[PDB]
Amino acid sequence: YFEISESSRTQWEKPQVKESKRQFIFDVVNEGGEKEKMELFVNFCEDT
Amino acid sequence: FWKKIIAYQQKLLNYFARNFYNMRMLALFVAFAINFILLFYKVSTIAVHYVLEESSGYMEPTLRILAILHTVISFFCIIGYYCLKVPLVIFKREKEVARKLEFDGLYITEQPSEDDIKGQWDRLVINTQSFPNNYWDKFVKRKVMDKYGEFYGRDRISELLGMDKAALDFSDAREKKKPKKDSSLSAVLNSIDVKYQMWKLGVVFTDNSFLYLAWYMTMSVLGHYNNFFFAAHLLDIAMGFKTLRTILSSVTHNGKQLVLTVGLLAVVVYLYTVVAFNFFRKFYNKSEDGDTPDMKCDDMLTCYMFHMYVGVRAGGGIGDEIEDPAGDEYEIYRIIFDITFFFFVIVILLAIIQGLIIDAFGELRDQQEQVKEDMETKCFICGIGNDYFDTVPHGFETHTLQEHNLANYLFFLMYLINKDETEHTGQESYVWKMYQERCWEFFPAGDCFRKQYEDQLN
Amino acid sequence: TMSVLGHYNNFFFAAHLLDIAMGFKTLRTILSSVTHNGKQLVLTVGLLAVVVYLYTVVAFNFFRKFYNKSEDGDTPDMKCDDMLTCYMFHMYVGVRAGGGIGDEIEDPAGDEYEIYRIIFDITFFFFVIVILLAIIQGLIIDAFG
Amino acid sequence: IAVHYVLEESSGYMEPTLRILAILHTVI
Ligand SMILES: Nc1ncnc2c1ncn2[C@@H]1O[C@H](COP(=O)(O)OP(=O)(O)OP(=O)(O)O)[C@@H](O)[C@H]1O
Ligand SMILES: O=c1[nH]c(=O)c2nc[nH]c2[nH]1
Ligand SMILES: [Ca+2]
Ligand SMILES: [Zn+2]
Numbered sequence: 001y002f003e004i005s006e007s008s009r010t011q012w013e014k015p016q017v018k019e020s021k022r023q024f025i026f027d028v029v030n031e032g033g034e035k036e037k038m039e040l041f042v043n044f045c046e047d048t
Numbered sequence: 049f050w051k052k053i054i055a056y057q058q059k060l061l062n063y064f065a066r067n068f069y070n071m072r073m074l075a076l077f078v079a080f081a082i083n084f085i086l087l088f089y090k091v092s093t094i095a096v097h098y099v100l101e102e103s104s105g106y107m108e109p110t111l112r113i114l115a116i117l118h119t120v121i122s123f124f125c126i127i128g129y130y131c132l133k134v135p136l137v138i139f140k141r142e143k144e145v146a147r148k149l150e151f152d153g154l155y156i157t158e159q160p161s162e163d164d165i166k167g168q169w170d171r172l173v174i175n176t177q178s179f180p181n182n183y184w185d186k187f188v189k190r191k192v193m194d195k196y197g198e199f200y201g202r203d204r205i206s207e208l209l210g211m212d213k214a215a216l217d218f219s220d221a222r223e224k225k226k227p228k229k230d231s232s233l234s235a236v237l238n239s240i241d242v243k244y245q246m247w248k249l250g251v252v253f254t255d256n257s258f259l260y261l262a263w264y265m266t267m268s269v270l271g272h273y274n275n276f277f278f279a280a281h282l283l284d285i286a287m288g289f290k291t292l293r294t295i296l297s298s299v300t301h302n303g304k305q306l307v308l309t310v311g312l313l314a315v316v317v318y319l320y321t322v323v324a325f326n327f328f329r330k331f332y333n334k335s336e337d338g339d340t341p342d343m344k345c346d347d348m349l350t351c352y353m354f355h356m357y358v359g360v361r362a363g364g365g366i367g368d369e370i371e372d373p374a375g376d377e378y379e380i381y382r383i384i385f386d387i388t389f390f391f392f393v394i395v396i397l398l399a400i401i402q403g404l405i406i407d408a409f410g411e412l413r414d415q416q417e418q419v420k421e422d423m424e425t426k427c428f429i430c431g432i433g434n435d436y437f438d439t440v441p442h443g444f445e446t447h448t449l450q451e452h453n454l455a456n457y458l459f460f461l462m463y464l465i466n467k468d469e470t471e472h473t474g475q476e477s478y479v480w481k482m483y484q485e486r487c488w489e490f491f492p493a494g495d496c497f498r499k500q501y502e503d504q505l506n
Numbered sequence: 507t508m509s510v511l512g513h514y515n516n517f518f519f520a521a522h523l524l525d526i527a528m529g530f531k532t533l534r535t536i537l538s539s540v541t542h543n544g545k546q547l548v549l550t551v552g553l554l555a556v557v558v559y560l561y562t563v564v565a566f567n568f569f570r571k572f573y574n575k576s577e578d579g580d581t582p583d584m585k586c587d588d589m590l591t592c593y594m595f596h597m598y599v600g601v602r603a604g605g606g607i608g609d610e611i612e613d614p615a616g617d618e619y620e621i622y623r624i625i626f627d628i629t630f631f632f633f634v635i636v637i638l639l640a641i642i643q644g645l646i647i648d649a650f651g
Numbered sequence: 652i653a654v655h656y657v658l659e660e661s662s663g664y665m666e667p668t669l670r671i672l673a674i675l676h677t678v679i
Contacts, residue, residue: 035438083559090588091570101588279563282556291546292553295641334615342615347659357624361605361631402636406644 017048050230061131068128071121075264076288078118079281085111086275115271118278122268126261130252137255138248139182145170146180146188155208156196166254173247175210181244190216260287294416298409306404313397317360320389321345321352324366328382331371360398365390427452430492432499451497539650547645554638558601561630562586562593565607569623572612601639606631 011017024044032040064071090101100107148154155174160167173179180186189209197205197213206213218224228235252258264284270277286292299306324332325345332345332354345351359366367386373379425434427444429452437443464472464480472480482490498505511518527533540547565573566586573586573595586592600607608627614620658665 035441035444087589087593089566091566276563276567279560282559285556286553289549291549295550295553299637334613344615353624357608357628361608361627363604398636402640405637406640409641410644410648 012048020044020048061127064124064128065131068125068132071125071128075118075121075125075281076284078114078121079278079284082111082114082118082271082275082278083282085114086278111275115275115278118281119265119268119272122261122265126258126265129257129261133257134248134252134255135182138251141166141170141251142173142180142183145173146183146185149174149192150188150195153196156192156200156205169247169250169254172243172250175208176241176244176247177210178241178244179209294412295409298405298412301408301412302404306401309397309401309404313360313393313401314356316392316397317355318352320359320366320385320393321348321355323385324355325351327378328370328385331373331382333371334369359389360393363394365394423448427496428454429457430496431494432496437498447496447498452492457491536650539646542649543645547642550638550642550645554601554634554642555597557633557638558596559593561600561607561626561634562589562596564626565596566592568619569611569626572614572623574612575610600630601634604635606635 021044024040028037028040028044085100085107088101088107089098091097092099100111102108149156152158154160154167155171160171162168180188185191189211192209193202193205193211193213202213264281267277267280286296325348329343329345332343332351333341334344334354335342344354355366358369362368365386366389370386373382373386376382424444426432427434427437427448434444437447440446460479461483464476464483467476469480479490482488508518508521527537566589570584570586573584573592574582575585575595576583585595596607599610603609606627607630611627614623614627617623658669660666
């Protein structure tokens with residue numbers, strides 16, 4: 001359990017972040033291998 | 049002198065074998081260039097002449113040089129692959145026939161079923177002074193004699209194998225063999241085995257790729273008689289590229305079904321031709337003017353040819369290219385005729401014929417995709433799924449590259465053959481005995497080291 | 507750049523109607539389907555080119571007199587007197603024709619080469635139109651799917 | 652006009668062969 005900021009929630013809800021999340025989800029689910037799925041997810045976290 | 053010439057000749061053969069592929073692609077360039085030059089002919093004036101419409105003017109000598117170079121390169125491309133893959137085919141066939149002779153007795157007890165071309169042809173090599181020439185087992189005759197001589201007649205077995213039964217014990221007593229130099233005459237006559245070379249040539253002409261190379265060389269030679277014969281070499285890109293090989297294989301993949309459905313289309317069009325020839329003859333006047341009629345259905349042969357050549361290719365069937373039935377006593381009958389022709393021949397049967405080849409192409413591509421998907425989902429040797437290894441990072445890659453590598457298995461088999469029999473370890477001797485007795489239970493089948501020690505390891 | 511060129515010529519603004527392709531997902535899918543099987547599509551187009559070239563060679567060597575595309579007998583517009591124009595005619599016309607080259611070339615009735623030319627036309631219609639064009643179309647359709 | 656369907660045969664044996672074949676087909 002930890003704390004999430006309302007500013008963080010707003011930035012996550014901003015449309016550009018949503019587009020990035022959609023693109024990342026498609027990339028990992030379709031062609032992203034399950035071997036490095038966590039690596040790709042952490043990279044996506046840092047970019048976001 | 050002889051040693052020098054033989055060394056140079058063997059060097060040339062080795063060079064051609066090494067550069068077989070490069071020379072094939074060079075032939076591909078030469079075919080492309082020759083055809084690009086050929087694309088500039090024109091007919092000039094009766095005596096008609098095919099002459100280049102060239103502005104620079106250097107194409108004609110360039111074309112002649114390129115044609116000569118293509119013929120030379122094709123000859124080199126056959127000499128290569130004759131020095132490269134013919135030995136492999138000969139070795140494989142020799143191994144097959146030796147194993148059939150030993151384990152199966154296919155020329156002592158069984159005999160070929162009289163319909164196998166290769167089974168019948170391979171009889172000639174059995175009674176040859178050099179039966180194993182690429183195959184490692186030089187005592188296949190001796191072991192066949194030991195296994196079958198006592199029961200089926202030692203004399204008959206020796207006569208069938210073309211060998212001497214009384215020579216083995218004498219050889220074990222003393223060798224009694226003398227080497228010799230090569231400058232002597234008729235030594236090549238004594239050494240050559242015309243029957244073995246005969247059988248080898250028969251196998252080579254049976255080989256498919258050698259036949260393709262021979263056809264390539266023949267078309268290259270015909271290109272000198274007529275330069276347009278070099279156009280047939282543009283089809284080599286089909287073999288060069290995989291998807292084109294798939295496209296060509298799709299044509300003959302459903303070969304029997306395609307032939308039979310073409311025959312069905314032929315039969316139904318013949319029935320329509322019969323109906324038209326018996327009832328709708330006056331509608332088949334393909335003459336633009338009333339001066340003379342060009343009747344296309346006055347006889348059955350021409351009516352059938354017209355139907356096939358025109359109605360099948362027509363978008364709307366025969367009714368597109370025959371007269372209009374308005375204001376006729378047979379108007380409704382001919383309307384039904386045309387509609388049924390368009391439905392059965394064009395809508396259904398032509399679609400089925402096309403779909404057979406399209407689905408064959410799709411099936412071949414899907415089979416290739418499934419093959420590629422496999423060996424990425426399960427191991428080739430054990431068959432265990434990839435995820436079980438993938439529980440640990442890089443697990444499947446480590447298992448397939450350091451634990452169950454088929455290349456490693458091949459290298460192990462080579463190491464067993466190269467290693468002396470006395471110095472085999474316990475595992476090496478175990479594998480060697482099982483391999484010699486053709487017992488493939490040493491291969492891990494559904495189990496691995498990690499699965500066996502799944503709790504000791506972690 | 508196209509917007510700037512639109513000031514030089516107002517019709518250059520037509521290229522911006524293609525932006526709906528990027529705007530909408532299914533149009534992006536349609537455009538991506540064209541290049542999805544890019545190598546296979548290029549190679550099968552090349553195969554169609556080679557086979558049509560072979561048919562052009564055969565026609566130029568044997569069936570030249572049948573390629574008169576002139577409506578009147580005053581002057582002949584021969585389309586296969588040279589290989590380049592014959593090949594261009596074959597690609598531009600026979601591929602687009604429903605029944606192949608035989609739809610747009612002369613009629614072979616009452617000729618010594620009648621059966622040979624009938625086989626020529628039927629094989630052209632089968633290999634080029636029925637098979638190869640269908641394969642080219644199906645590559646893109648299946649890429650979209 | 653009276654139209655007749657007649658074999659365009661060069662050898663000339665097809666017509667009796669055709670009749671024999673038709674009878675054989677019915678029997679078979
Ligand atoms: N027992 C196995 N031994 C080796 N490779 C295996 C085995 N089981 C499955 N494989 C798979 O076979 C593939 C071998 O790689 P690949 O065939 O591409 O090698 P290559 O011939 O060096 O490559 P390339 O075709 O690019 O020249 C890998 O994807 C590997 O996971
Ligand atoms: O370790 C880190 N990872 C990050 O993504 C990051 N962003 C700011 N600072 C950071 N430190
Ligand atoms: Ca020992
Ligand atoms: Zn394995």
